Amino acid sequence: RGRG
Amino acid sequence: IGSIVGILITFINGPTEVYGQFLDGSPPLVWDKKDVPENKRTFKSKPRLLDIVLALYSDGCFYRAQIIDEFPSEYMIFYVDYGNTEFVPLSCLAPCENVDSFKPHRVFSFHIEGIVRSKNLTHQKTIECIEYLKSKLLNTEMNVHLVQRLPDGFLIRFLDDWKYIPEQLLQRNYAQVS
């Protein structure tokens, strides 16, 4: 999904 | 209430400024290597200044970027939905279709109100503050108070769950009051  | 908006921090521009999206529920604009097979991986004309392309970040996933500079061996690129600047070669770039390219750019600049970067901040201490804010805020979703609109972007104020961040920046001499 989004970056971590 | 209406002055509170939801944001996602994507990048730390400086000790008192971050880049981020407004939260509205729409899914992120990112492509797997599985959704970029090689028909879509080569252009009809070599990309150039200001063109909007897909670019490969360190996580191995494609994001929308704009070439903001060009040299013989590298491009300098800006991720329009995330806000970090990188240097890449042509092999890291893929054509981005017009349906995906026309979507508005999602990154905006927010300033923490009431504080500015310390004048005495050294290069190393500046790097360290960026790393601290990365540890706390990077890719973090949270509601904030939109204090003001600025020419650059927005002036926000943290709520009770994150009001400690400016306090720590002041405590650690990363920041002074305005």
Author numbering:
A (entry chain I): 13 to 16
B (entry chain B): 568 to 745
Can you list sentences taken from the study reporting this PDB entry?
Amplification of piRNA in the ping-pong cycle requires assembly of a tertiary complex scaffolded by Krimper, which simultaneously binds the N-terminal regions of Aub and Ago3. To promote generation of new piRNA, Krimper uses its two Tudor domains to bind Aub and Ago3 in opposite modification and piRNA-loading states. In addition to its self-interacting N-terminal region, Krimper contains two extended Tudor domains: eTud1(272-512) and eTud2 (562-746). Overall, our results reveal that the two Tudor domains of Krimper have distinct architectures that are responsible for the differential binding of two PIWI proteins.
To gain a detailed understanding of the interaction between Krimper (eTud2) and Aub, we undertook structural studies. We solved the crystal structure of the Krimper (eTud2) domain in complex with the Aub-R15me2 peptide that showed the highest binding affinity in ITC experiments. In the 2.7 Å structure the eTud2 domain adopted a typical Tudor subdomain and a staphylococcal nuclease (SN)-like subdomain (Tudor-SN) architecture. sDMA-modified Arg-containing peptide binds within a negatively-charged cleft between the Tudor and SN domains, and is specifically recognized by a conserved aromatic cage consisting of four aromatic amino acids Tyr624, Tyr630, Tyr646, and Tyr649, stabilized further by hydrophobic and cation-π interactions. In addition, eTud2 Asn651, which is conserved amongst other extended Tudor domains, forms a hydrogen bond with the guanidyl nitrogen of the methylated Arg15. The binding pocket of eTud2 is similar to that of other Tudor domains and contains four aromatic residues that interact with sDMA. As sDMA modification of Aub signals its piRNA-binding status, the binding of eTud2 to modified Aub ensures that the complex contains Aub/piRNA.
